[PDB]
Short mmCIF file of C-alpha atoms in Angstrom, two decimals:
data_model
loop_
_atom_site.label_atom_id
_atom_site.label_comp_id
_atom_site.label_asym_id
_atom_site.label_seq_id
_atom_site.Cartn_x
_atom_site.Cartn_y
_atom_site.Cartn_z
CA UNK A 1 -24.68 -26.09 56.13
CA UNK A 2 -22.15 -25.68 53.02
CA UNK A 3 -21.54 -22.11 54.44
CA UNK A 4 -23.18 -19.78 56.73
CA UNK A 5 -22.88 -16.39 55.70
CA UNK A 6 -22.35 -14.22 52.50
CA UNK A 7 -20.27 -15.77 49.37
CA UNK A 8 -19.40 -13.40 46.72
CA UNK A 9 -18.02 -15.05 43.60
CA UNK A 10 -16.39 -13.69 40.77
CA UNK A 11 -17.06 -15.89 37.61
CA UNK A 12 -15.10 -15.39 35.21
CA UNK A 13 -16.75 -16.02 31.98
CA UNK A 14 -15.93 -13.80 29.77
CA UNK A 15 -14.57 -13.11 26.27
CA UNK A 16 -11.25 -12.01 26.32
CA UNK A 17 -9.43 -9.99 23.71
CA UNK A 18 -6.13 -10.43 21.48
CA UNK A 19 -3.68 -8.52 20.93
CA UNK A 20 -0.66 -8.87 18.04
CA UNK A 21 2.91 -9.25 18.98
CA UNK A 22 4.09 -6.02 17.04
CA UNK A 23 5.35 -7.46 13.90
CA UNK A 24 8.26 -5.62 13.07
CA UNK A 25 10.91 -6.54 15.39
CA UNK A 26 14.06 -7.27 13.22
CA UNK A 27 16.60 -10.05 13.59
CA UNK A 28 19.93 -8.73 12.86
CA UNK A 29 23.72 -10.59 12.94
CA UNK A 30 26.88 -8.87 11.46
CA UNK A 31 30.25 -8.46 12.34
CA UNK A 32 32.22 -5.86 14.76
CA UNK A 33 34.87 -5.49 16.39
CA UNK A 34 34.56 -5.81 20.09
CA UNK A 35 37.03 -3.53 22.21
CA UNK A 36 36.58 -0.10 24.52
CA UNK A 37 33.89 1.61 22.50
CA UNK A 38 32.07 -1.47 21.47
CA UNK A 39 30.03 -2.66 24.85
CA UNK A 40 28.50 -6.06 23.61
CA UNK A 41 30.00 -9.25 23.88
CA UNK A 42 30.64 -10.83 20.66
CA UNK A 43 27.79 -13.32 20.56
CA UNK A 44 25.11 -11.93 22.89
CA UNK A 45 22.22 -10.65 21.50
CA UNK A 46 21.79 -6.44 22.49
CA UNK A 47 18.25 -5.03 22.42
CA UNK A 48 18.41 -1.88 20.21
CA UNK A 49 15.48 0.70 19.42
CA UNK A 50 17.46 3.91 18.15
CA UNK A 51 20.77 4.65 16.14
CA UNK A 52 22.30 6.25 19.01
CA UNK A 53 22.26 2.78 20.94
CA UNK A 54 23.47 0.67 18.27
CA UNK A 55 26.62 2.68 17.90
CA UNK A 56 27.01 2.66 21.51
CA UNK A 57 26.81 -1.21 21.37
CA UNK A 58 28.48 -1.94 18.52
CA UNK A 59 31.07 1.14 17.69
CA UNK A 60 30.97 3.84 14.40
CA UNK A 61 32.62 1.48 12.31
CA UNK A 62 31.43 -1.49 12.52
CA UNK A 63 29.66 -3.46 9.66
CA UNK A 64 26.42 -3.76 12.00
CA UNK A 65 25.80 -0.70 12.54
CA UNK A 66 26.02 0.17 9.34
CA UNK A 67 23.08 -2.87 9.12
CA UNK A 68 21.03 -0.58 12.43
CA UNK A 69 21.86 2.96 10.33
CA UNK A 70 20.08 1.38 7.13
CA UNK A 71 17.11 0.53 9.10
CA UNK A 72 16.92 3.66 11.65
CA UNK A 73 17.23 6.05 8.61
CA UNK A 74 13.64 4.74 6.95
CA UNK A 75 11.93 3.61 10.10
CA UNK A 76 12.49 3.28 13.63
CA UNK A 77 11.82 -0.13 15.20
CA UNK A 78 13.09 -2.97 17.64
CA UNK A 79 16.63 -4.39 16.59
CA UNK A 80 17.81 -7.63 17.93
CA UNK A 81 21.13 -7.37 16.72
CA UNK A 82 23.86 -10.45 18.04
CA UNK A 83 26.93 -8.90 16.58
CA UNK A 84 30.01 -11.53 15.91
CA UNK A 85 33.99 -10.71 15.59
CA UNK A 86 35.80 -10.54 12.32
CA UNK A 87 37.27 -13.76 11.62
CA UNK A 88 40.18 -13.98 9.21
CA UNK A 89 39.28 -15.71 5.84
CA UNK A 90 35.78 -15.08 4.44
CA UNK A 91 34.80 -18.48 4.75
CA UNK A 92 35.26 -19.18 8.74
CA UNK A 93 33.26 -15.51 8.83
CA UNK A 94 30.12 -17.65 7.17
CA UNK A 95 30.45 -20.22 9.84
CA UNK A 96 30.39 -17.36 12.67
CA UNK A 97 27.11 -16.14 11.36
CA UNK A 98 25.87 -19.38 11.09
CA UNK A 99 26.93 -19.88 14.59
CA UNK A 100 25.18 -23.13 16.06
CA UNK A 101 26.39 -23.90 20.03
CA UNK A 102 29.31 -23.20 22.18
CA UNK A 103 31.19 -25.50 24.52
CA UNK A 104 29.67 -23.34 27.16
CA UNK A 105 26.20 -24.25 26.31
CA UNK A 106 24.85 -21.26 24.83
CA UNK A 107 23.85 -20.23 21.36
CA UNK A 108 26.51 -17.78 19.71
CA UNK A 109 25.60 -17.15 15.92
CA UNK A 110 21.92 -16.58 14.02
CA UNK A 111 20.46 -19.06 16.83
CA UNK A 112 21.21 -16.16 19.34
CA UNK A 113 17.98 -14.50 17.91
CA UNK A 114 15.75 -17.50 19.11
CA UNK A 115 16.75 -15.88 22.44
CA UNK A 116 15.26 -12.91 21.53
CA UNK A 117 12.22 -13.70 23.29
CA UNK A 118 13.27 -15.13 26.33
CA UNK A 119 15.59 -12.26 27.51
CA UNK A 120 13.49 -9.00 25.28
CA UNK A 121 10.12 -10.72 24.96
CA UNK A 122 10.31 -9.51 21.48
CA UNK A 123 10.79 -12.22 19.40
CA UNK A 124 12.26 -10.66 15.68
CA UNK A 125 10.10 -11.40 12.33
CA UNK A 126 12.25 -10.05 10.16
CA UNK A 127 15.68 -12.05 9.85
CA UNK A 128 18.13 -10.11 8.31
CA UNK A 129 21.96 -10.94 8.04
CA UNK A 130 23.28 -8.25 5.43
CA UNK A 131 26.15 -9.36 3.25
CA UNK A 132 26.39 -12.84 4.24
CA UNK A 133 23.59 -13.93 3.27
CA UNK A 134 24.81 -14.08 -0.17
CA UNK A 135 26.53 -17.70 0.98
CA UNK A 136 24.30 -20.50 0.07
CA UNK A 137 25.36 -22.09 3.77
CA UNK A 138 24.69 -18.75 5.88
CA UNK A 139 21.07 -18.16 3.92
CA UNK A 140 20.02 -22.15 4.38
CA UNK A 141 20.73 -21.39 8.50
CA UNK A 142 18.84 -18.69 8.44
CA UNK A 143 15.81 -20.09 6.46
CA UNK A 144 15.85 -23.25 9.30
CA UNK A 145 15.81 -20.07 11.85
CA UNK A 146 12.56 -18.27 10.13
CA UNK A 147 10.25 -20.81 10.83
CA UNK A 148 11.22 -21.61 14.21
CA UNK A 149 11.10 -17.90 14.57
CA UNK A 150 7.93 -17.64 11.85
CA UNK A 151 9.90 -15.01 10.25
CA UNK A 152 10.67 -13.59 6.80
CA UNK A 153 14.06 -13.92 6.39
CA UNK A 154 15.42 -11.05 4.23
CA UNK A 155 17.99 -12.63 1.62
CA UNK A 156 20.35 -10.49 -0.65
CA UNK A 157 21.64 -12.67 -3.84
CA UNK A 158 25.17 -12.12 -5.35
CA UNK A 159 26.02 -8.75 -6.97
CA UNK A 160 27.15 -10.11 -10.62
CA UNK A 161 24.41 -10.35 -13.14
CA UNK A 162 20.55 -11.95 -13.46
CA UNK A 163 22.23 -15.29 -14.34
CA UNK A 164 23.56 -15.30 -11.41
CA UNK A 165 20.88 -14.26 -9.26
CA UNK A 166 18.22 -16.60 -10.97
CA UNK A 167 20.73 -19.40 -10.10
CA UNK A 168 20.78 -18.05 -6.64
CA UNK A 169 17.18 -17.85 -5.60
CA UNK A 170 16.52 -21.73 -7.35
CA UNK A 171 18.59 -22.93 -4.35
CA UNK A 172 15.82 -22.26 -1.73
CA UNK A 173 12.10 -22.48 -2.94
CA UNK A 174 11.09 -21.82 0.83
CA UNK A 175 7.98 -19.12 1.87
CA UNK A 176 10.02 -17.62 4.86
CA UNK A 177 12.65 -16.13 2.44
CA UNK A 178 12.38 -12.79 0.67
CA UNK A 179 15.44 -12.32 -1.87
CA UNK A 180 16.38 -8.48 -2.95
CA UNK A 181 19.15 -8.34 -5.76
CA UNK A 182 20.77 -5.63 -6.83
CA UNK A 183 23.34 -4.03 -4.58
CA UNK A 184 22.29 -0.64 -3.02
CA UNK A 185 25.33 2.01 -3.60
CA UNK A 186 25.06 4.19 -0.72
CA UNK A 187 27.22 6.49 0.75
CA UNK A 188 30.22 5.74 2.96
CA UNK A 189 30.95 8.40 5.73
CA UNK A 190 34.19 6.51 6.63
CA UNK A 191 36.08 6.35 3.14
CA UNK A 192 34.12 9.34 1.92
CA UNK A 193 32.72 7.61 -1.54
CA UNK A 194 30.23 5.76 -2.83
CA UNK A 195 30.49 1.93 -1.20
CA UNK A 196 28.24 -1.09 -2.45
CA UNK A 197 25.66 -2.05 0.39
CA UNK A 198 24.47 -5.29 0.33
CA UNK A 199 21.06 -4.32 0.11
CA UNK A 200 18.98 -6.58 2.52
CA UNK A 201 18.84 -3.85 5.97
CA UNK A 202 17.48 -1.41 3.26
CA UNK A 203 14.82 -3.97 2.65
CA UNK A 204 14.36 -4.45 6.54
CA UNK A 205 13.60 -0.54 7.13
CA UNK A 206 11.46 -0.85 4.41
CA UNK A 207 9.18 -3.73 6.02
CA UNK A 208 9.57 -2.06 9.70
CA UNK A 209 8.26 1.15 8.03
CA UNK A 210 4.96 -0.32 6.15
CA UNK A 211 4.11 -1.63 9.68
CA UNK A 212 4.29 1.83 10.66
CA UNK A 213 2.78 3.80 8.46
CA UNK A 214 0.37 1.47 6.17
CA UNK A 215 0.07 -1.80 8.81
CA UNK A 216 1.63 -5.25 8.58
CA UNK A 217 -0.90 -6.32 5.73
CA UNK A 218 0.89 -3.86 3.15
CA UNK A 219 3.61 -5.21 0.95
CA UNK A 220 6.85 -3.00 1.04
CA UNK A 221 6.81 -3.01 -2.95
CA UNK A 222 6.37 0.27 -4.02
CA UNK A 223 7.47 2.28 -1.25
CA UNK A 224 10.48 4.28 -1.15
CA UNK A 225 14.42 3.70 -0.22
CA UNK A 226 15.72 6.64 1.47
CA UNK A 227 19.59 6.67 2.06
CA UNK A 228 20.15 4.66 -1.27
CA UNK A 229 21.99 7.05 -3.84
CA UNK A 230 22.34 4.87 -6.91
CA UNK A 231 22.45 0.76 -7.37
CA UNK A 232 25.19 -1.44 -8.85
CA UNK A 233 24.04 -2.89 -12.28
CA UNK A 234 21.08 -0.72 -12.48
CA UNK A 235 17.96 -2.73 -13.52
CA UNK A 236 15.40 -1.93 -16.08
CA UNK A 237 12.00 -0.49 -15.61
CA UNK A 238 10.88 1.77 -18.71
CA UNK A 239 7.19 2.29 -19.07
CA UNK A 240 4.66 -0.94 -18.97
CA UNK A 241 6.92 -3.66 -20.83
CA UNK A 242 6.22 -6.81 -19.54
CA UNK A 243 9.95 -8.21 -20.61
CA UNK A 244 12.07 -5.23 -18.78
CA UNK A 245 14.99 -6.40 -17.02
CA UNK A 246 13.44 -6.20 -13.49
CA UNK A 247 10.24 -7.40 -14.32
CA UNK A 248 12.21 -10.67 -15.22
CA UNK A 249 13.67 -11.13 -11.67
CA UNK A 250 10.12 -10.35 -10.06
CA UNK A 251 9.12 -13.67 -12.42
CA UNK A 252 11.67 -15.27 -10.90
CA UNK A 253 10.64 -14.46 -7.26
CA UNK A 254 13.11 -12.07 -6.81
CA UNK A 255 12.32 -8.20 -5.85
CA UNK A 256 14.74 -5.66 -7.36
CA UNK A 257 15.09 -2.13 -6.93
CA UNK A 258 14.29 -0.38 -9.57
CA UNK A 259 14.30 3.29 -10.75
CA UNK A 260 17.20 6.34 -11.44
CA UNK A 261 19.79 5.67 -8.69
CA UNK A 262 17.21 3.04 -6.82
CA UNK A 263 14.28 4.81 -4.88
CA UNK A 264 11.70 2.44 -5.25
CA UNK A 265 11.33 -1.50 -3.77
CA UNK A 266 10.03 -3.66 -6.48
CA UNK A 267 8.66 -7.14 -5.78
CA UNK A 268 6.00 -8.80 -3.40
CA UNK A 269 7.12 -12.46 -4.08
CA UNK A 270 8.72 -14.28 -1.72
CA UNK A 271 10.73 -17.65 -2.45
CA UNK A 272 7.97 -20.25 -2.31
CA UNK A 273 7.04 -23.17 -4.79
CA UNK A 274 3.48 -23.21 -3.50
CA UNK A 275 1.44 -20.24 -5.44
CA UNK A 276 -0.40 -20.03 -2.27
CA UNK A 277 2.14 -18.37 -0.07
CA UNK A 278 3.79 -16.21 -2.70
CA UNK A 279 2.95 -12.96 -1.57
CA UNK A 280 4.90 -11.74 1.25
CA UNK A 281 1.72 -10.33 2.56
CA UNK A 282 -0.36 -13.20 2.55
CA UNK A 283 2.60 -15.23 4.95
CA UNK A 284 3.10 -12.23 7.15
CA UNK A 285 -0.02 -11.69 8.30
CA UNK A 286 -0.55 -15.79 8.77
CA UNK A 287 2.25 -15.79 10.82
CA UNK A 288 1.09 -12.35 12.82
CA UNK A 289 -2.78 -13.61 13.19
CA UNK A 290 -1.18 -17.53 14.59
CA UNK A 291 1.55 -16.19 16.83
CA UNK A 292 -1.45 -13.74 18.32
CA UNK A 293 -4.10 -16.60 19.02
CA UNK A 294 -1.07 -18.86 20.38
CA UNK A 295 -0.17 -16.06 22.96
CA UNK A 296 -4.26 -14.54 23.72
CA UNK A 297 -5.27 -18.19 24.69
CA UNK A 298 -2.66 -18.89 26.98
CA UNK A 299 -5.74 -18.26 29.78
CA UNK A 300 -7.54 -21.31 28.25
CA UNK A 301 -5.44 -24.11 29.28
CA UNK A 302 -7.40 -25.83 31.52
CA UNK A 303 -10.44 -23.94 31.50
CA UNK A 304 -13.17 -26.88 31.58
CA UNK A 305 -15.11 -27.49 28.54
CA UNK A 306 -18.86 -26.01 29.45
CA UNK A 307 -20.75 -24.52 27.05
CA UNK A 308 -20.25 -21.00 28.04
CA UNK A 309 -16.52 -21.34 27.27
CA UNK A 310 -16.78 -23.05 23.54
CA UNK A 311 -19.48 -19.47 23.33
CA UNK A 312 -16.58 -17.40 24.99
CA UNK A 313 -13.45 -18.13 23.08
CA UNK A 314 -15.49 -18.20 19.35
CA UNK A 315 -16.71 -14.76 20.73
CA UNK A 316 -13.35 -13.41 21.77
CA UNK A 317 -12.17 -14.63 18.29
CA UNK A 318 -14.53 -13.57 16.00
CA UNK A 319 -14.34 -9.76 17.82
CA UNK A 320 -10.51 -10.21 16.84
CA UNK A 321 -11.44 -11.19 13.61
CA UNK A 322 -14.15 -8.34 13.11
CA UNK A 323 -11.37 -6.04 14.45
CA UNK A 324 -8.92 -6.73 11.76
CA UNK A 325 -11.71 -6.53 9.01
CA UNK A 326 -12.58 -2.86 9.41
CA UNK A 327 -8.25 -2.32 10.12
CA UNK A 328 -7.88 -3.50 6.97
CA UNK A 329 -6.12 -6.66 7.18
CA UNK A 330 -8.57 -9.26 6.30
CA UNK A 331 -11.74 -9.12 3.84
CA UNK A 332 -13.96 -11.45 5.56
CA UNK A 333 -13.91 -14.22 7.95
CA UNK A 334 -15.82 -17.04 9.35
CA UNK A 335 -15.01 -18.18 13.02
CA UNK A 336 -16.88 -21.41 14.24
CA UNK A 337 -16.54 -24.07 16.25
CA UNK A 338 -15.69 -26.91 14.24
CA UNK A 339 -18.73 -29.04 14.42
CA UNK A 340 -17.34 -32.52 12.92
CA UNK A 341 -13.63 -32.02 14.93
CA UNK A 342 -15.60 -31.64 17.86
CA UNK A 343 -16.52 -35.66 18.31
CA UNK A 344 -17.63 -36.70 22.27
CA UNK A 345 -14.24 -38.64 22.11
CA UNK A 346 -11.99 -35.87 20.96
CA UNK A 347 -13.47 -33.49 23.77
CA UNK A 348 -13.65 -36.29 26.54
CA UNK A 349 -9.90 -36.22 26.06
CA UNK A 350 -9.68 -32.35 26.69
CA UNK A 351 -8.93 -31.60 22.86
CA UNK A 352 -11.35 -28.93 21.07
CA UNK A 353 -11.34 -27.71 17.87
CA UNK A 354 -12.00 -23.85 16.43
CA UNK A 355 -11.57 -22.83 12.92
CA UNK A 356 -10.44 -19.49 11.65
CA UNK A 357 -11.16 -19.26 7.81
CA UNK A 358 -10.13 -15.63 6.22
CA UNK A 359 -9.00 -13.80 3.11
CA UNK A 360 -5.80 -12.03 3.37
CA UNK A 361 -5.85 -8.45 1.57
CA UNK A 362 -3.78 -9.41 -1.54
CA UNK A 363 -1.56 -6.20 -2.67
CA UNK A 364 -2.82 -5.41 -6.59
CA UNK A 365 0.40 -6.16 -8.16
CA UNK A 366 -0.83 -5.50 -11.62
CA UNK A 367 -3.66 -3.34 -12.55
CA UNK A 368 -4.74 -3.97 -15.45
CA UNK A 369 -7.22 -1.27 -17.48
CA UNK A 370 -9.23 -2.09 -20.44
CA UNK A 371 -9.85 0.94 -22.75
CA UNK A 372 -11.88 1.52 -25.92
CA UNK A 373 -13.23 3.79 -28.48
CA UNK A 374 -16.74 2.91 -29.23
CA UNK A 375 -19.83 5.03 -31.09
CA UNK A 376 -21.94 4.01 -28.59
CA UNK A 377 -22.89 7.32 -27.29
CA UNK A 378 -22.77 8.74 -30.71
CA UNK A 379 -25.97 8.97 -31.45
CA UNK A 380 -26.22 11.16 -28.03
CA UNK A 381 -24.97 14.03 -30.08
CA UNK A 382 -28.88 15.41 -31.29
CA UNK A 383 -30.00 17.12 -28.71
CA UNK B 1 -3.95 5.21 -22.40
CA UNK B 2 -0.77 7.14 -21.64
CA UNK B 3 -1.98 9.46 -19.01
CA UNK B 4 -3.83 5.97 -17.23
CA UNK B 5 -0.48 4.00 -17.24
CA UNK B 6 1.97 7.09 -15.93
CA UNK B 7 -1.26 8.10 -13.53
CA UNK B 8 -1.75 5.04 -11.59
CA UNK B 9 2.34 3.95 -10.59
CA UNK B 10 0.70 4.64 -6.88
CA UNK B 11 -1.81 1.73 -6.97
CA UNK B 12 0.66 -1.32 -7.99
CA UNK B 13 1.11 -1.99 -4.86
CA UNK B 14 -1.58 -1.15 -2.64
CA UNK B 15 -3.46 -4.02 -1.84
CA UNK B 16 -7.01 -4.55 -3.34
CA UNK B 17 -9.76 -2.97 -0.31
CA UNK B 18 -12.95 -2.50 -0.89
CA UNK B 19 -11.99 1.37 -0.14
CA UNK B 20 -9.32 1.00 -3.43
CA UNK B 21 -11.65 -0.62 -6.53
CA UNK B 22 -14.29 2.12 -5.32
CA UNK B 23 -11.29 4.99 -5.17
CA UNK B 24 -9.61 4.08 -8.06
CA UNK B 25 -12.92 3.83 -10.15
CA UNK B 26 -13.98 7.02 -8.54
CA UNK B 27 -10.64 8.55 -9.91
CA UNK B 28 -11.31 7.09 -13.20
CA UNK B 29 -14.87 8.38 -13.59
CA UNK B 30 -13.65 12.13 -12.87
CA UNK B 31 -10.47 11.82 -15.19
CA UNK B 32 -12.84 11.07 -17.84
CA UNK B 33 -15.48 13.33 -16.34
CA UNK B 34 -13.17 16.32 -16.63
CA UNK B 35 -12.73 14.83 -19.88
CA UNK B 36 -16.11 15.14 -21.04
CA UNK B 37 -17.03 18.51 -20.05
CA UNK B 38 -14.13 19.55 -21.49
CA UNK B 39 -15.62 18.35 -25.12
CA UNK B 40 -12.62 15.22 -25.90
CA UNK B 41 -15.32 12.73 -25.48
CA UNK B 42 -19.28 12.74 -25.77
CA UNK B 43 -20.14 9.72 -23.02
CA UNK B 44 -18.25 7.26 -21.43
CA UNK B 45 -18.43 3.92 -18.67
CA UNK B 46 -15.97 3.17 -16.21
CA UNK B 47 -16.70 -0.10 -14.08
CA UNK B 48 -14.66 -2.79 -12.62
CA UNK C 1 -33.84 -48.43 37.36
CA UNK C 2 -36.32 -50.03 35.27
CA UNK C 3 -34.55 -53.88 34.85
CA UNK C 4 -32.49 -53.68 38.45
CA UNK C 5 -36.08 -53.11 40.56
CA UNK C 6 -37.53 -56.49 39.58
CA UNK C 7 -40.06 -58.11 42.00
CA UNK C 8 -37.93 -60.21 43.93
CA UNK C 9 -35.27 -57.51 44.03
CA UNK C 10 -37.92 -55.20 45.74
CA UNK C 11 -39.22 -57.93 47.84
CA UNK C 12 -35.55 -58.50 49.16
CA UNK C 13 -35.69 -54.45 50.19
CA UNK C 14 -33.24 -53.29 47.23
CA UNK C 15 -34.40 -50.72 45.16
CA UNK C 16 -31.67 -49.14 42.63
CA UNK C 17 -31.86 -45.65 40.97
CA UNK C 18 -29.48 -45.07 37.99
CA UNK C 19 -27.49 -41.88 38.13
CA UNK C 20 -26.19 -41.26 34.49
CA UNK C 21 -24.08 -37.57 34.21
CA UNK C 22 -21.45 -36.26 32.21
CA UNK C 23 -18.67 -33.85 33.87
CA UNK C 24 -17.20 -30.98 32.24
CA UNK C 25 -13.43 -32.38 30.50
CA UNK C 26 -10.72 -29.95 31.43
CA UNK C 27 -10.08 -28.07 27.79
CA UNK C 28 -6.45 -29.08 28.05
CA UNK C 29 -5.85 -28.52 24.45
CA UNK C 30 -7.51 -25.93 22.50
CA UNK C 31 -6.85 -26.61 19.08
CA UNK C 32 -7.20 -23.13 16.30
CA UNK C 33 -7.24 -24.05 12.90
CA UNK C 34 -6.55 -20.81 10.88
CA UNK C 35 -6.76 -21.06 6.70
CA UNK C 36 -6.08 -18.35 4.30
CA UNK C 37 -9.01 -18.51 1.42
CA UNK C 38 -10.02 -16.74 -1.68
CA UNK C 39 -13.67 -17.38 -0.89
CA UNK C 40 -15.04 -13.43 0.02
CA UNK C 41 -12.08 -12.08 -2.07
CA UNK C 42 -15.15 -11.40 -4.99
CA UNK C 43 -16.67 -9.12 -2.45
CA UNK C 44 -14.30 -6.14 -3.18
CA UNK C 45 -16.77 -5.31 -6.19
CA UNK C 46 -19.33 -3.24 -4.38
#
């Protein structure tokens, strides 16, 4: 007698489901000032999800939440903002933003944002550090921080001319790292005039917006700036030609902002060598549908290899597939089992393989239409 | 090929669907539809 | 067992049976291998 009475089991076999960790939480590390009416110590990193608890954080005045008022004005999302104090030449303020460890034990600068998941569980995916990120050794940090973060670290190259912006963005040649010229001119509430911004939280609101409004798969590149009232050195855009002034920094994987006193994001080209991962959309959406099977198939650990469980995870991932198709992420997929990977030694030692093949949705960067006159339906005229 | 370059600055950017070749192409047709009727052309073909 | 049950073995009172079985591995490490394509990207044409 194994047991004597009524068992009732519960067995657990099932599919599960996926969900995706929100894609638009944004990384963000200026300076303040810390005193009475800023509450955040200088290197921790503050949670913020509206403009009236970023300048209770950080103070009117301060340079970050000038970086939180960019963002809140075009979209409202999650802000991990770390905030640093103003150091006294312009160069030691580089290596606060860069940051790296205390003598305490405890990361102070950018690296504060990899404990944006362990204190928020919302880990950011959009690294922006506005202004400083101009410095070759602040932007090179924070491109070593987007892929431990799988990020897309929002760059901002020097406000003097193309020459100096195409020597800028050769420095990197790195997937994670979006690069947005010319300097927004936006308006200053403090001074009461027209200051330069440095153009990279306009970019942020613009890729926590898209998320919003037209999903994560949607490049930000032709949607709309809203608190930007002109841009320095005003780039060219006139009606199709192929050699305008902003169409030359898009060759060079730089976006620009484009049109009469800058309403309009131009560029969907990120800073990689590969032609592979040169759309921002096509690396945002591989790091969205690899950080969302990492975290869904945390249940499958040490599940036992039967047969109904190989069935029950390729059926919980092709529904996540199938459930992206008809979103509109992804085009097609195929979601198998992989059937060489899957050798009698490599499961005997507990590892199993799946592959996840899929087309991203590429954004159509250049439609191109083909007209002519022909007399082909001439002779229709006779009746 | 004026009115097709200043009328379609809202698809350079919108990521190629199946629901966009079909609803630009479906935009295309009836600008040249409205075009016909209206006696500019005799007959026309718009494909991808 | 069809070498182990010889004459003399079964004259001696041993018989053997063979009991061959696999157990179910623990699926310590499931491994996802995701790639980006351009394989259905021709099937946004109808």
């Amino acid at each position: 007698s194994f047991f004597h009475g009524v068992t009732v089991t519960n067995v657990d076999i099932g599919a599960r489901t996926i969900a995706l960790p929100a894609s638009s939480v944004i990384g963000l590390c200026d300076v303040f000032t810390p005193g009475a009416q800023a509450s955040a110590k200088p290197n921790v990193p503050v949670l913020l999800t509206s403009k009236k608890d970023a300048a209770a954080a950080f103070g009117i005045g301060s340079s970050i939440y000038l970086a939180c008022e960019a963002i809140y004005n075009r979209a409202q999302a999650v802000i991990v903002a770390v905030g640093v104090e103003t150091a006294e030449t312009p160069e030691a303020q580089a290596s606060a933003v860069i940051g790296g460890i205390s003598a305490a034990g405890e990361r102070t600068g950018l690296q504060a944002l990899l404990d944006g998941k362990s204190r928020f569980n919302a880990q950011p995916r959009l690294l922006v550090a506005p202004g400083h990120s101009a410095q070759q050794a602040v932007a090179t940090a924070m491109d070593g921080l987007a892929e431990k973060l799988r990020a897309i670290a929002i760059l901002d190259g020097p406000n003097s001319t193309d020459e100096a912006a195409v020597a800028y963005a050769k420095n990197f040649g790195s997937k994670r790292l979006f690069m947005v010229d010319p300097g927004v001119q936006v308006w200053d509430s403090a001074t009461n005039a027209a200051r330069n911004a440095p153009a990279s939280a306009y970019a942020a609101g613009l890729f926590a917006w898209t998320d919003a409004e037209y999903g994560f798969w949607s490049s930000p590149s032709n949607k709309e700036i809203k608190g930007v009232t002109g841009t320095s050195r005003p780039v060219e855009f006139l009606d199709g030609d192929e050699t305008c002034r902003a169409n030359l920094l898009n060759n060079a994987n730089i976006a620009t902002i484009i049109r009469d006193d800058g309403y309009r994001l131009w560029g969907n080209r990120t800073l990689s060598s590969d032609s592979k991962w040169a759309f921002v959309t096509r690396v945002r959406t591989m790091d969205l549908v690899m950080d969302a099977i990492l975290a869904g198939h945390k249940w499958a650990v040490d599940r036992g290899i039967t047969k109904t469980y190989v069935k029950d995870v390729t059926e919980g991932l092709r529904a996540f597939m199938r459930d992206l198709k008809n979103q509109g992420a992804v085009i097609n997929f195929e979601v198998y089992a992989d059937p060489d990977l899957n050798s009698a030694s490599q499961l005997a030692q507990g590892k199993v393989y799946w592959n996840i093949r899929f087309t991203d949705v590429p954004p159509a960067e250049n439609p191109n239409f083909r007209v002519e006159v022909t007399d082909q339906w001439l002779t229709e005229v006779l009746d």
